[PDB]
Ligand binder design. Sequence first.
Ligand SMILES: Cn1cc(C(=O)NCCN2CCCC2)ccc1=O
Length: 116
Amino acid sequence: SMSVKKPKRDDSKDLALCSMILTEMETHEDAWPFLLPVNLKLVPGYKKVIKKPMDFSTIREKLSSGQYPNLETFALDVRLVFDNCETFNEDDSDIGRAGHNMRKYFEKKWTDTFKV
Ligand SMILES: Cn1cc(C(=O)NCCN2CCCC2)ccc1=O
């Protein structure tokens, strides 16, 4: 409360650590469905069904331009990528399995990096 401060984790490395995680996502073999925005004029249904599209290159732009206030907002956009994937793709399609693979890959790095 007012003038009563909870001890706070050191957040000074967060930007560089989220950038390192994002780099490893971008270089993952199954990243290819997520590297660029889904082409709304070539993929039927995507615009109407998926209300908040998101991809690694948009995340990288937002990270390089100070559009994430904290690490939780960065993780929310990463998870949005995979939530959108599940909404639109069959679990066992190539794109759909890629999404499940990438989500697991991301959450481990997230726990390994920040749940010290
Ligand atoms: C995440 N997501 C991606 C697509 C897609 O077609 N991505 C472009 C794939 N390119 C084709 C070869 C190179 C990459 C469709 C639905 C979807 O949910």
